[PDB]
Structure formats: structure tokens, C-alpha cells
Amino acid sequence: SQIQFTRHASDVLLNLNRLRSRDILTDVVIVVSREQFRAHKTVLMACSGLFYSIFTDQLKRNLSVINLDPEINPEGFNILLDFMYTSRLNLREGNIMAVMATAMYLQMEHVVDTCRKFIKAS
Amino acid sequence: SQIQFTRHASDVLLNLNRLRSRDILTDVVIVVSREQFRAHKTVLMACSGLFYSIFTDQLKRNLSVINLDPEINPEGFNILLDFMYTSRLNLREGNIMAVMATAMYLQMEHVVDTCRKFIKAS
Ligand SMILES: O=C(O)C[C@H](C(=O)O)N1C(=O)/C(=C2/C(=O)Nc3ccc(Br)cc32)SC1=S
Ligand SMILES: O=C(O)C[C@H](C(=O)O)N1C(=O)/C(=C2/C(=O)Nc3ccc(Br)cc32)SC1=S
Ligand SMILES: O=C(O)C[C@H](C(=O)O)N1C(=O)/C(=C2/C(=O)Nc3ccc(Br)cc32)SC1=S
Ligand SMILES: CC(=O)NS(=O)(=O)c1ccc(Br)cc1
Ligand SMILES: CC(=O)NS(=O)(=O)c1ccc(Br)cc1
Numbered sequence: 307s308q309i310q311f312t313r314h315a316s317d318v319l320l321n322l323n324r325l326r327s328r329d330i331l332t333d334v335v336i337v338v339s340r341e342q343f344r345a346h347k348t349v350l351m352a353c354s355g356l357f358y359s360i361f362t363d364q365l366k367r368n369l370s371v372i373n374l375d376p377e378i379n380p381e382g383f384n385i386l387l388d389f390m391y392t393s394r395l396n397l398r399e400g401n402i403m404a405v406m407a408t409a410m411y412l413q414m415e416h417v418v419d420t421c422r423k424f425i426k427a428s
Numbered sequence: 429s430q431i432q433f434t435r436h437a438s439d440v441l442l443n444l445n446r447l448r449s450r451d452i453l454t455d456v457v458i459v460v461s462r463e464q465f466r467a468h469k470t471v472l473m474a475c476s477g478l479f480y481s482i483f484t485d486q487l488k489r490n491l492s493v494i495n496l497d498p499e500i501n502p503e504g505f506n507i508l509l510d511f512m513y514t515s516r517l518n519l520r521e522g523n524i525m526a527v528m529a530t531a532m533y534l535q536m537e538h539v540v541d542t543c544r545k546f547i548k549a550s
Binding site for chain 2: 308309310311312313314315316317318319321322325330331346347348349351352353361362389390393394395396397416420424
């Protein structure tokens, strides 16, 4: 059997995030009513069922700008975008409802599950 | 502090690899003598110093085809591309030399070290 590098996935992830913070190869701008977020489409698709369906759409595949539902709050989206790239979720009793609703919309099932844990713990 | 999802990086990587095997959003063809490999530039850049330097070159940035040193054997490159996307390295006394040299060329330092320990072990 293959040697298994248990640290490889999170090294790739950390470099993807360094790519993003230096804006290298980012190929999409996510629009949330007024606010803008630069990302890599494959990372978005690897993290969210919604992005998977969007960029798997023959029509929408080649857009450089994607509008999401403009009722999404942008803070909740921002928290979720940093999570995608860092595996770290900034959850608090001050944002929990916003972040959870945005994760449901984005179809990020692990995050919605942990949000249910957090509600039940506090 | 932020809740840490210790399984996130590896679920992203497993979906990046499902994207690859369905050919979704692959945006580069790697040419290895005669053989062709499809991949996503950001994953190559996240995993290899060589691809980091290639796709960060303003001149080579937008190329859909990358030709590598024709002296690289394709089997050693193929094992290393699967590793990037799965974290599993198929190393054996039958390919160790090819894999190690291709890892050095691609500037994948963690793989190179492991190969060194594999040599030391047998
Ligand atoms: O069986 C199917 O046809 C796929 C099935 C679906 O959409 O019907 N599915 C997915 O592929 C989902 C994905 C996801 O959330 N991130 C991802 C990254 C790469 C790939 Br390929 C898929 C997903 S969620 C879902 S259901
Ligand atoms: O082409 C683009 O720039 C964006 C693209 C589209 O319409 O093809 N798009 C949307 O507008 C999307 C929405 C969504 O998911 N929920 C929503 C609620 C209200 C409104 Br108005 C829009 C959406 S998802 C998507 S892709
Ligand atoms: O100091 C610097 O400017 C960076 C330094 C360099 O090129 O001089 N360096 C890198 O950024 C290297 C990377 C790599 O192998 N995969 C990667 C993914 C994302 C990012 Br950002 C970097 C790498 S290897 C290297 S040396
Ligand atoms: C779900 C996750 O990433 N981690 S966790 O299981 O350790 C967890 C975190 C916070 C609360 Br409150 C309850 C559980
Ligand atoms: C410290 C630890 O074991 N895990 S953790 O960092 O993911 C964490 C869990 C719950 C909260 Br509430 C805040 C942090």
C-alpha cells in the first residue's frame, strides 16, 4: 500500500490560501449585493454544493462575476469564505444565525452540522 | 478562537480529485514527452515549486499546455500527480528512483524527504 501523508491536504490548503491573499490565479469575483470577494472557482466547488451546481452549469461556467442572492449577508459569507480556505470557522453567539443560514444556502453540510452543535451546547 | 475542522482540508482535496477525474474546470494539459495529463493550475502550484514558478511567470501564466523536460518519465510524473490530489504516494523499490528524481525536478520537498527515508529503510 501507498505511503499516506497525513499533512499533505492541509499544506495544499495553506498554499491555496496564500495564493488567494496574493490574488494569484483567482478567476472569479463573488458578488453579494454590493460587496465583492475574489476566489478560485475549484476551491468554491470543492467546499460548497451551490458553487458546485453553479460552475457545473454550462451556461454560468465561464462568468468572471457571480451574483448570489443579494439578501445573503456579506459578513456571514466572508466568514464562510475564510473557513473554506483555512479550515477555521469563526463562530459566536453574535454571528451564529447569520453564518448558519449562509452555510445552508451555500450547502456546506459539515458547517451547518457544527452550527447545530454550537446551538445545542450554548 | 475559531473552531477548527481537522477534516476539512482533506474533504476539499477529495473533491478536487473528483473534479479532476470528471474533468471539471481542469485548465492545463501537462506534456511529458509524448504523454498528456489534465489538472488544475492552482493545485499544481499548491503542490510543486516548479509549477509555482511556471504559473507565476507573466509570460507562461496563460498557457493551456505545459511542456516539461522530456527526460521526465511519465510513470514517475503520474504517481506524483495522483499524490498531489490524494496524499497517497505509490513508492516501491521499482519506481523509487524515477519518483524521487521527478520529485526533485518538480520541487516537492516533502516527497523528496520521504523517498530519502524509504531509501534509508531498505
Ligand atoms: O452524484 C453526483 O452527480 C454529484 C453530487 C450531485 O451534485 O448530485 N454532489 C456533488 O458532487 C457535491 C459536491 C460538493 O459539495 N463539492 C463537490 C466537489 C466536486 C464534485 Br465532482 C462534487 C461536489 S454535493 C452533491 S449532491
Ligand atoms: O449570473 C450571475 O451573475 C448570477 C447567477 C444567475 O442568475 O445566473 N445567479 C443568481 O442570480 C443566483 C441566485 C441564488 O442562488 N439565489 C438567488 C436569489 C435572488 C436572486 Br436576484 C438571485 C439568486 S445563483 C446564480 S449563479
Ligand atoms: O517568498 C516567496 O515569494 C515564495 C517562495 C518563492 O517562490 O520564492 N515559494 C513559494 O511560494 C513556493 C510555493 C509552492 O511550492 N507552492 C506554493 C503555493 C503558493 C504559494 Br504563494 C507559494 C508556493 S515554493 C517557494 S520557494
Ligand atoms: C464540529 C467541529 O469541527 N468540532 S467539534 O466537534 O469539536 C465541536 C466544536 C464546537 C462545539 Br460547541 C461542539 C463540537
Ligand atoms: C480547542 C479544541 O479542542 N477545539 S477547537 O479549537 O476546535 C474549538 C472548539 C470549540 C470552540 Br466553542 C472553540 C474552539
